[PDB]
């Protein structure tokens, strides 16, 4: 039994725990969200397949690590799905070839939020996997740990729906111009979806966001969002009706709005949060 990652780096087998760096592409699916498919990341082979046949299972106590430590889910192992954290040992994968075959493992997450996400940074631990290696010819039976680290910055979707972007940046035309905000949303299966805006408001009506621009900033103006010509105030539920696998625009448009007093020349900036809810 010998393994290597996608980039050809060898995984030392046995000894202490191994730090295995892998790529993530988290997506929502029906009834579960994918954190990582290791079958494209880890590949393994047998050097004496004619005489020796290697067996490898996933031992119980394999669980998420780091920011994901908190979550539960499943692990699809060799076509079958099992709860994750693993409560019992999985069935074995056979390694009877000198040709590198992938390690058929995919880590899933049970949806808990509407459209939430967890930031996962490059270099951070995401799972702690305990493996048990045996063979068909002698009594060698050994366990070792594979700490799975992320090789790229991603955001694991913790809900039934996924946003087109976690950080949107729009540029307003010069005052008093407006511009649409590019942002859509979709769900694994149909969800009666809505959302509301949050952030620091300038007015009592909670419909204008404060200008937090630092350098040569404008006075007397803030940012205000509209949808179909209708002003959207903060902490106000916007219904999107039924949202399915097809992306549905939020319909949001950015605008300027006077906050009161003389309007003076300068930069304008406003950070506005969007939070999704079920209905």
């Amino acid at each position: 039994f010998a393994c290597k990652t996608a980039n050809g780096t060898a995984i030392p087998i046995g000894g202490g725990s191994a730090n295995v760096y892998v790529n993530l592409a988290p997506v929502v699916n029906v009834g579960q969200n994918l954190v990582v498919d290791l079958s494209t990341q880890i590949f393994c082979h047998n050097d004496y397949p004619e005489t020796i046949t290697d067996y490898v299972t996933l031992q119980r106590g394999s669980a998420y690590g780091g920011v994901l430590s908190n979550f539960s889910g499943t692990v699809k192992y060799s076509g079958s799905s099992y709860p994750f954290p693993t409560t019992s040992e999985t069935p074995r994968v056979v390694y009877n070839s000198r040709t590198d075959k992938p390690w058929p493992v995919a880590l899933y997450l049970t949806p808990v939020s509407s459209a939430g996400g967890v930031a996962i940074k490059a270099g951070s631990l995401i799972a702690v996997l305990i493996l048990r290696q045996t063979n068909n010819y002698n009594s060698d039976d050994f366990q070792f740990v594979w700490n799975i680290y992320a090789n790229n910055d991603v955001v694991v979707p913790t809900g039934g729906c996924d946003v087109s972007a976690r950080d949107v940046t729009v540029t307003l035309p010069d005052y008093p111009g407006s511009v649409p905000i590019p942002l859509t949303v979709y769900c694994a299966k149909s969800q009666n979806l809505g959302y509301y805006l949050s952030g620091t408001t300038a007015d009592a009506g909670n419909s204008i966001f404060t200008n937090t621009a630092s350098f040569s900033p404008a006075q007397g103006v803030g940012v205000q969002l509209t949808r179909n010509g209708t002003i959207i105030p903060a902490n106000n539920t916007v219904s999107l009706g039924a949202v399915g696998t097809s992306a549905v625009s939020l319909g949001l448009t950015a605008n300027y709005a006077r906050t009161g007093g003389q309007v003076t020349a300068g930069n304008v900036q406003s950070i506005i949060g969007v939070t999704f809810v079920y209905q």
């Binding site: 949107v168 010069d174 966001f209 020349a265 304008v268 406003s270």
Partner: peptide, 12 residues
Amino acid sequence: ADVTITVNGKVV
């Protein structure tokens, strides 16, 4: 929040 919209603008 789920998404963060940073609006940039100018008053000339």
